[PDB]
Design a protein around this nucleic acid. Structure first.
Ligand code: CA
Ligand code: CA
Ligand code: CA
Ligand code: CA
Length: 298
DNA sequence: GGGTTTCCACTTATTCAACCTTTTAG
DNA sequence: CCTAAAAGGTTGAATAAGTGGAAACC
């Protein structure tokens, strides 16, 4: 059932789940020896295929396909379709550092719109653009286009623009979790509700702003080898009851995350009724938990 | 139909989400 | 003593991003 997604929900979701793409491919059938492909894409779990169909219908662009065993993607690379992407993100701009990637995608669009990508000089300009996009140059492009190139990206400083963006972002990178803490009590399990949003460290400022915007929570920094990311986290029930739950009751989530939030809420009500301290209440929470998050079948 | 664009199957890197246990706060 | 909140992580790919191959187009 195709439903129109609000454009700021969509942009918040794009900030959490979109990726731009710029292919500069060796091609023995291209006059300059390289062909290109420019686009935007989203990859989700199969259980969320509906989001992709809603976006495909809301925009009128893109093609949907399996992405391996368990995921599905919406890719938009038809050049004329990319005008839709630009019109959307011009009106409802990305908020995270991905915004810099959007601007690089715009620059590549302009090169191609002037048909300059059919010249080697235009291929070279696309390479300079791609050197700053996402993961930058591949080994093949480094080898083929030796050049000291600026690598500094525009640092993005933008406030959360409105709460629909936040609902979109949370639908992508958020998590509603029932933590079962093993204790020695007679019941022997403490039920703890956790709300989290996870993000690369490059957007520490935006994540830190969530403390102010939502009136609760804290930031946990995590490092693993050379990689760093952050979790905005809320574990205090009174904050979950009075701030997190009413926020998302008002600003609706999309996809499977919505059902997780609803289940989470059913656990919160049980907790408020103190039935998490009874055996029968705990069994019910355990049963709700088994069907949340990755365990959910559909 | 030659050069170019678009699509579709599928993979690589690593940023997510989701999942744990132990300790501290109240 | 008791429960709630925070601290302190780990797991593993539903990560973000990218690739190989060719059909479709004009
Ligand atoms: Ca994300
Ligand atoms: Ca994704
Ligand atoms: Ca997600
Ligand atoms: Ca995500």
């Amino acid at each position: 059932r195709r439903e129109s997604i609000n454009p700021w929900i969509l942009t918040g979701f794009a900030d959490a789940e979109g990726s731009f793409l710029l292919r500069i491919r060796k091609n023995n059938k291209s006059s300059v020896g390289y062909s290109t492909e420019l686009g935007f894409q989203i990859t989700l779990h199969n259980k969320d295929k509906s989001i992709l169909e809603n976006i495909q219908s809301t925009w009128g662009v893109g093609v949907i396909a399996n992405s391996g065993d368990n995921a599905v993607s919406l890719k938009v690379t038809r050049f004329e379709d990319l005008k839709v992407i630009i019109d959307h993100f011009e009106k409802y701009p990305l908020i995270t550092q991905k915004y810099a990637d959007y601007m690089l995608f715009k620059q590549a669009f302009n090169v191609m719109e002037n048909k300059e990508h059919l010249t080697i000089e235009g291929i070279k300009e696309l390479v300079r653009i791609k050197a700053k996009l996402n993961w930058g140059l591949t080994d093949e492009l480094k080898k083929a286009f030796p050049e000291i190139i600026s690598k500094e990206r525009s640092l993005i400083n933008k406030n959360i623009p409105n709460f629909k963006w936040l609902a979109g972002f949370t639908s992508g990178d958020g998590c509603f979790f029932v933590n079962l803490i093993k204790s020695k009590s007679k019941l022997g399990v403490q039920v703890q509700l956790v709300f989290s949003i996870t993000q690369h460290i490059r957007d520490k400022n935006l994540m830190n702003s969530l403390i102010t915007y939502l009136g609760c929570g804290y930031i946990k920094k995590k490092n693993k080898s050379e990689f760093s990311w952050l979790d905005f986290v809320v574990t205090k029930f009174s904050d979950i009851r009075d701030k997190i739950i009413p926020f998302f009751q008002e600003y609706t989530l999309i996809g499977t995350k919505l059902k997780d939030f609803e289940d989470w809420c059913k656990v919160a009500k049980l907790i408020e009724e103190k039935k998490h301290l009874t055996e029968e209440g705990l069994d019910e929470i355990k049963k709700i938990k088994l069907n949340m998050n990755k365990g959910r079948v559909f």
